[PDB]
Amino acid sequence: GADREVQRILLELLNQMDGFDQNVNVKVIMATNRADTLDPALLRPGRLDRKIEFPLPDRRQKRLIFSTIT
């Protein structure tokens, strides 16, 4: 299959992510714009609990980025 080996990686990561050391939580931050690894299972609460979408800087957000860089 070839693709199966990549799928095997997704399963292995999902098993580790499950519940990790509850209080000493190993927080995992993901910024991959890929639907193939974006299975519903990864998106399930208990895996990627919070989803934040980054909008293209608009007016006001751009003014802040420009002011800080200048």
Ligand X SMILES: Nc1ncnc2c1ncn2[C@@H]1O[C@H](COP(=O)(O)OP(=O)(O)OP(=O)(O)O)[C@@H](O)[C@H]1O
Q: Which amino acid is at 68?
A: T
Among 4, 46, 50, 60, binds ligand X (CB under 6 A): 46
Q: Closest distance between another protein and the C-beta of residue 55, in Å?
A: 17
Residue 21 within binding range of ligand X, rule CB under 6 A: no
| Whole-number Å distance between alpha carbons of 70 and 68 | 6
Residue 28 within binding range of another protein, rule CB under 8 A: no
Cα angle for residues 69, 55, 34 (degrees, 5° grid):
115
Residue 41 within binding range of another protein, rule CB under 8 A: yes
Cα dihedral sign for 37, 31, 54, 22?
Answer: positive
Q: Closest distance between another protein and the C-beta of residue 70, in Å?
A: 30
Binding-site ranges for ligand X (CB under 6 A): 18, 46
